[PDB]
Amino acid sequence: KTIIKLGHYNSDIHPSHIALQEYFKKTIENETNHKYEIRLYPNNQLGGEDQIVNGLRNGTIEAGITGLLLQNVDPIFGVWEWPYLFKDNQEAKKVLESPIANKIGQKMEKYGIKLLAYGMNGFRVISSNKKLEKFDDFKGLRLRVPLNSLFVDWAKAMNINPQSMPLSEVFTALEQKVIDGQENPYMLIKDSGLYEVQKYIIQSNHIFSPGLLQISLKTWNKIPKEDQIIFEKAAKLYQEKEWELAIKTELEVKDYLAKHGNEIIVPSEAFKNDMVNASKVLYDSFYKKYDWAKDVVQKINEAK
Numbered sequence: 001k002t003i004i005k006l007g008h009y010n011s012d013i014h015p016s017h018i019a020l021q022e023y024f025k026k027t028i029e030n031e032t033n034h035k036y037e038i039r040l041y042p043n044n045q046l047g048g049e050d051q052i053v054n055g056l057r058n059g060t061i062e063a064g065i066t067g068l069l070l071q072n073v074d075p076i077f078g079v080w081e082w083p084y085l086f087k088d089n090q091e092a093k094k095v096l097e098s099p100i101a102n103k104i105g106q107k108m109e110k111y112g113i114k115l116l117a118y119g120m121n122g123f124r125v126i127s128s129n130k131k132l133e134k135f136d137d138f139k140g141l142r143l144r145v146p147l148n149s150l151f152v153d154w155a156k157a158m159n160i161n162p163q164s165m166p167l168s169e170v171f172t173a174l175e176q177k178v179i180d181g182q183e184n185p186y187m188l189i190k191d192s193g194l195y196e197v198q199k200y201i202i203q204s205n206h207i208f209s210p211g212l213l214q215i216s217l218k219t220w221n222k223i224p225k226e227d228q229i230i231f232e233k234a235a236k237l238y239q240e241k242e243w244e245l246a247i248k249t250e251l252e253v254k255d256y257l258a259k260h261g262n263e264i265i266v267p268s269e270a271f272k273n274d275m276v277n278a279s280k281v282l283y284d285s286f287y288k289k290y291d292w293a294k295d296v297v298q299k300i301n302e303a304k
């Protein structure tokens, strides 16, 4: 009997967790005569996101959902979070279901990880103690960013002062007045309780964050193809159901946050355009330092 521990950083009521429970775990456990058990560990129980990545690579954490932190080993994996790459949720899903996304996903095997599905965490918004409604308001702003220099660079391009830290440190950084806010999808902002200590939510949607369902290659190579087909069936069902649930749930969460004291700012056309224009410096740099960037972005655009 094979026990597969599956760790992630989201809440047990995040759509990823619900879909893991109902579709991924159940499909595998039932359709393999209970030969595999998929034990779920939400909310950083098995460690923070970076620890999950490392555990997938060394095999001590057999499965997981993470974002794109493996980009610190090979930057190609971080491409999906480049700013303003996708116009909306449906376009993000369409591109992540395309051949180029599959091909980049396959490259994770070189680093010990088998990718099973691209799911959705969502577009990222800025939460803040300070009202932000025009580009000049970023000056002086101290924002936590994730453990990924892309986000450090993004923040600097916005004239924001970033401080990269693990997600588990955000509450205490706010409480200590070390930062003014952070950025993450709407559902994380609710599920985490960050909304209770962040008056303003600014709907920047600057970056789209996928949640990658992954299995350690060390684990995968012990599973015969007949059984892998069942894991793949479960991952495909997980993916369809998770996108659907995530889109539905995000709309609920947006309404919730409107009605519990938070002030949601939808950027003006000018604020929007200023953010978009400011982000171009990131792409200028990608095209200079990555020999694959021109081709990859072209294929991503062709898949839209």
Ligand SMILES: O=C(O)[C@@H](O)[C@@H](O)[C@H](O)[C@@H](O)CO
Pocket (backbone or CB within 6 Å): 049, 066, 067, 068, 069, 081, 145, 146, 147, 148, 166, 167, 183, 184, 209, 210
């Ligand atoms: O804010 C966080 O901690 C996470 O949203 C990120 O670490 C995200 O999962 C990664 O995709 C960022 O590259």
